[PDB]
């Protein structure tokens, strides 16, 4: 439905949608912009990520509320209320999976293959890991292990590039490590790996802060604080 709108107009409207907190619209505009077939600039990649993270974030929060209700309903002593809780949890789950599949589809056709600079390639591979991780959060069947491995593989390729091509304080590198650490802790049942990654990432960033301007220092330390927050929660 965005095929008739100019690329620049889609970008302009994505920014307006962000200001209005209309994240579904924002994501539709940015999907339209991606489907024009040109590479995305740094700002445009950030708009794409903001839009879909907010959309899926609302779905994930709703899914967790419904999953908790469903789990309580299957405890000993709980009254049978019928299929409605499961049905509605499934409805939200299916919508969430659809958004993840949409993002993964944009990455595969054709954002990743055209992304040659480290900042773009790592950004998109992190996104791929993230949306496979959100699929893993709801997966229960025979492909769960393969979904988990798809997240792991994308994160690992992003880590390998980021370590070779970016300084330890780069905000993309830091946010990637933060999310891969969460993957290890929450998805892969590897809390020690999660803690080791968060600690090493934090310490290597600390040692590189001296090279930065004030503005870059602010950007990097904000994400380092998220790593510290998780270390405090987990240890």
């Amino acid at each position: 439905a965005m095929g008739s709108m100019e690329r620049a107009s889609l970008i302009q409207k994505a920014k307006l949608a962000e200001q209005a907190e209309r994240y579904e619209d924002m994501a539709a505009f940015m999907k339209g912009a991606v489907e024009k077939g040109e590479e995305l600039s740094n700002e445009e990649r950030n708009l794409l990520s903001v839009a879909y993270k907010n959309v899926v974030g609302g779905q994930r929060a709703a899914w967790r509320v419904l999953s908790s209700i469903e789990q309580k309903s299957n405890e000993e002593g709980s009254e049978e209320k019928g299929p409605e809780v499961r049905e509605y949890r499934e409805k939200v789950e299916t919508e969430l999976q659809g958004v993840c599949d949409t993002v993964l589809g944009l990455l595969d056709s054709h954002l990743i293959k055209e992304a040659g600079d480290a900042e773009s390639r790592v950004f998109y591979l992190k996104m791929k890991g993230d949306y496979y991780r959100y699929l893993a959060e709801v997966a229960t069947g025979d492909d769960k292990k393969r979904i988990i491995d798809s997240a792991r593989s994308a994160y690992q390729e992003a880590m390998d590039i980021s370590k070779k091509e970016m300084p330890p304080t780069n905000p993309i590198r830091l946010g990637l490590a933060l999310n891969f650490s969460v993957f290890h802790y929450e998805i892969a049942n590897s809390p020690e790996e999660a803690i080791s990654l968060a600690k090493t990432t934090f310490d290597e960033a600390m040692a590189d802060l001296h090279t930065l301007s004030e503005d870059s220092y602010k950007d990097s330390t904000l994400i380092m604080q998220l790593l510290r927050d998780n270390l405090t929660l987990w240890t």
Partner: peptide, 8 residues
């Protein structure tokens, strides 16, 4: 406290 992942 819910663990942190990267900002949108």
């Amino acid at each position: 406290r819910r663990r942190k992942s990267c900002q949108a």
